[PDB]
Design an enzyme around this catalytic site. Structure first.
Site, short mmCIF file in Angstrom:
data_model
loop_
_atom_site.label_atom_id
_atom_site.label_comp_id
_atom_site.label_asym_id
_atom_site.label_seq_id
_atom_site.Cartn_x
_atom_site.Cartn_y
_atom_site.Cartn_z
N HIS A 1 1.85 0.63 -13.19
CA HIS A 1 2.68 -0.49 -13.61
C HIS A 1 4.14 -0.05 -13.55
O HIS A 1 4.48 1.04 -14.07
CB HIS A 1 2.32 -0.95 -15.01
CG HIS A 1 3.16 -2.08 -15.51
ND1 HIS A 1 2.96 -3.39 -15.13
CD2 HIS A 1 4.22 -2.10 -16.36
CE1 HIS A 1 3.85 -4.16 -15.73
NE2 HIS A 1 4.62 -3.40 -16.49
N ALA B 1 -7.47 -1.57 -19.75
CA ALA B 1 -8.17 -2.20 -20.86
C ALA B 1 -8.19 -3.70 -20.60
O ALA B 1 -7.68 -4.19 -19.59
CB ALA B 1 -7.51 -1.86 -22.19
N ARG C 1 -13.03 -15.66 -12.17
CA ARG C 1 -12.81 -14.22 -12.12
C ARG C 1 -14.13 -13.46 -12.11
O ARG C 1 -14.32 -12.52 -11.32
CB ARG C 1 -11.94 -13.77 -13.30
CG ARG C 1 -10.49 -14.20 -13.17
CD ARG C 1 -9.59 -13.74 -14.32
NE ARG C 1 -8.39 -14.58 -14.38
CZ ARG C 1 -7.36 -14.49 -13.53
NH1 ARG C 1 -7.35 -13.59 -12.54
NH2 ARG C 1 -6.34 -15.32 -13.67
N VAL D 1 -4.08 -6.99 -20.52
CA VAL D 1 -3.28 -6.55 -19.39
C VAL D 1 -2.20 -5.58 -19.85
O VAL D 1 -1.52 -5.82 -20.85
CB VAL D 1 -2.66 -7.76 -18.67
CG1 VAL D 1 -1.76 -7.27 -17.52
CG2 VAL D 1 -3.75 -8.68 -18.16
N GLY E 1 0.76 -1.24 0.00
CA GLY E 1 0.00 0.00 0.00
C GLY E 1 0.79 1.29 0.00
O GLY E 1 0.24 2.34 0.35
N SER E 2 2.07 1.26 -0.40
CA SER E 2 2.81 2.51 -0.53
C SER E 2 2.15 3.44 -1.55
O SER E 2 2.04 4.65 -1.32
CB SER E 2 4.27 2.23 -0.92
OG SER E 2 4.38 1.66 -2.22
N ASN F 1 -4.44 1.98 -13.50
CA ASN F 1 -3.51 1.01 -12.95
C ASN F 1 -2.11 1.59 -13.01
O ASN F 1 -1.76 2.29 -13.97
CB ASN F 1 -3.56 -0.31 -13.72
CG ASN F 1 -2.53 -1.29 -13.25
OD1 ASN F 1 -2.58 -1.77 -12.10
ND2 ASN F 1 -1.57 -1.60 -14.11
N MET G 1 -3.14 -7.42 -7.79
CA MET G 1 -2.44 -8.35 -8.66
C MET G 1 -3.37 -9.30 -9.42
O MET G 1 -2.87 -10.20 -10.12
CB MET G 1 -1.42 -9.15 -7.85
CG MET G 1 -0.22 -8.34 -7.37
SD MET G 1 0.61 -7.34 -8.66
CE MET G 1 0.81 -8.55 -9.99
N1 XSO Z 1 -8.04 -6.94 -17.98
C1 XSO Z 1 -6.98 -6.33 -17.19
N2 XSO Z 1 -6.21 -5.43 -17.80
C2 XSO Z 1 -5.24 -4.82 -17.14
O1 XSO Z 1 -4.44 -3.86 -17.79
C3 XSO Z 1 -5.02 -5.14 -15.79
C4 XSO Z 1 -4.00 -4.60 -14.91
C5 XSO Z 1 -4.04 -5.13 -13.61
C6 XSO Z 1 -3.16 -4.81 -12.43
C7 XSO Z 1 -2.68 -6.13 -11.91
C8 XSO Z 1 -1.25 -6.26 -12.39
C9 XSO Z 1 -1.12 -6.65 -13.87
C10 XSO Z 1 -0.86 -8.15 -13.80
C11 XSO Z 1 -1.73 -8.74 -12.93
N3 XSO Z 1 -1.71 -10.00 -12.69
C12 XSO Z 1 -0.82 -10.74 -13.28
C13 XSO Z 1 -0.99 -12.20 -12.87
O2 XSO Z 1 -0.47 -13.10 -13.43
N4 XSO Z 1 -1.91 -12.35 -11.75
C14 XSO Z 1 -2.30 -13.60 -11.16
C15 XSO Z 1 -2.30 -13.48 -9.65
C16 XSO Z 1 -0.88 -13.45 -9.07
C17 XSO Z 1 -0.98 -12.99 -7.62
O3 XSO Z 1 -2.04 -13.22 -6.95
O4 XSO Z 1 -0.03 -12.35 -7.11
C18 XSO Z 1 -3.74 -13.82 -11.56
O5 XSO Z 1 -4.56 -12.86 -11.47
O6 XSO Z 1 -4.09 -14.95 -11.98
C19 XSO Z 1 0.13 -10.22 -14.16
F1 XSO Z 1 1.03 -11.07 -14.74
C20 XSO Z 1 0.14 -8.85 -14.45
S1 XSO Z 1 -5.31 -6.25 -13.57
C21 XSO Z 1 -5.85 -6.10 -15.19
N5 XSO Z 1 -6.82 -6.67 -15.91
N1 GAR Z 2 1.87 -5.99 -12.10
C1 GAR Z 2 1.46 -4.92 -11.20
C2 GAR Z 2 2.62 -4.47 -10.34
O1 GAR Z 2 3.76 -4.93 -10.52
N2 GAR Z 2 2.33 -3.56 -9.39
C3 GAR Z 2 3.39 -2.99 -8.61
O2 GAR Z 2 3.32 -3.48 -7.25
C4 GAR Z 2 3.79 -2.48 -6.33
C5 GAR Z 2 2.77 -2.23 -5.24
O3 GAR Z 2 3.42 -1.56 -4.16
P1 GAR Z 2 2.53 -0.94 -2.98
O4 GAR Z 2 1.69 -2.11 -2.50
O5 GAR Z 2 3.58 -0.47 -1.99
O6 GAR Z 2 1.72 0.16 -3.64
C6 GAR Z 2 4.08 -1.23 -7.15
O7 GAR Z 2 5.49 -1.13 -7.33
C7 GAR Z 2 3.39 -1.46 -8.50
O8 GAR Z 2 4.07 -0.85 -9.57
#
Ligand code: XSO
Ligand code: GAR
Length: 200
Positions: A108, A140, A64, A143, A11-12, A106, A89
């Protein structure tokens, strides 16, 4: 604009968003914090700031779509206008993403389109870039492929690890994520009908 922040971890980014939205001139208010995992540190940061929390364990749902529907229910309960994924995640389903199209952001930890996916820093270090960064984008269905709102470059230093690089990148995340939220909350930036970023 009423905002939900979804978290999976520390949660930073949440805390940076809390700090920014308490500013008098903030266009956003954080009305609910949703975690998919219990007893994560972001839940404490939320309670310390007096923000409602809800845990929605993804492990309890058939798929999901059901789990996203449980989140959507809480989003409606709190009349949310904007969703911030901050360390959340769980990949979201098409219908949920379509519903919140142009209203979900989001963070990233790379300069998209480089290094999509869950381990951006590892990729960045394995590829050997000397500049990486972080990206705030609209969610979108693909991912990490939604429309880009802000980015900030961050240098890779020799000897960096995931620990040290992610630490530097998070300093930029705490800048561009509050900035990107304020841009959307105030209607300065919106997803266009043509689907590109629109700076009204
Ligand atoms: N449609 C849609 N578009 C997006 O742009 C978007 C962005 C998001 C933010 C989340 C981070 C992006 C991401 C999330 N998840 C995984 C993954 O593999 N997640 C596993 C669980 C692993 C765990 O629990 O730590 C799973 O969900 O099965 C990943 F490789 C990359 S969600 C999302 N959805
Ligand atoms: N694939 C998504 C991803 O890598 N998210 C990343 O997780 C961290 C969350 O930190 P936080 O919990 O301290 O905000 C952040 O660094 C963010 O970019």
């Amino acid at each position: 604009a009423r905002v939900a922040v979804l978290i999976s971890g520390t949660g930073s980014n949440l805390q940076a968003l809390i700090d920014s939205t308490r500013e008098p001139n903030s266009s956003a208010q954080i009305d609910i914090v949703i975690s998919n995992k219990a007893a994560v540190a972001g839940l404490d940061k939320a309670e310390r700031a007096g923000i409602p929390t809800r845990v929605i364990n993804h492990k309890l749902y058939k798929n999901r779509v059901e789990f996203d529907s449980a989140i959507d229910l809480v989003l409606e309960e709190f009349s949310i206008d904007i969703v911030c994924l901050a360390g959340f995640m769980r990949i979201l389903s098409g219908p949920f993403v379509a519903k919140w199209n142009g209203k979900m952001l989001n963070i990233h930890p790379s300069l998209l389109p480089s290094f999509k996916g869950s381990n951006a820093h590892e990729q960045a270090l394995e590829t050997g870039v000397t500049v990486t960064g972080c990206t705030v984008h609209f969610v979108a269905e693909d991912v990490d492929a939604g429309q880009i709102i802000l980015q900030e470059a961050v240098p890779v230093k020799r000897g960096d690890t995931v620990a040290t690089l992610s630490e530097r990148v998070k300093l930029a995340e705490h800048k561009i994520f509050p900035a990107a939220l304020q841009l959307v909350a105030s209607g300065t930036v919106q997803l266009g009908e043509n689907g590109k970023i629109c700076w009204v």
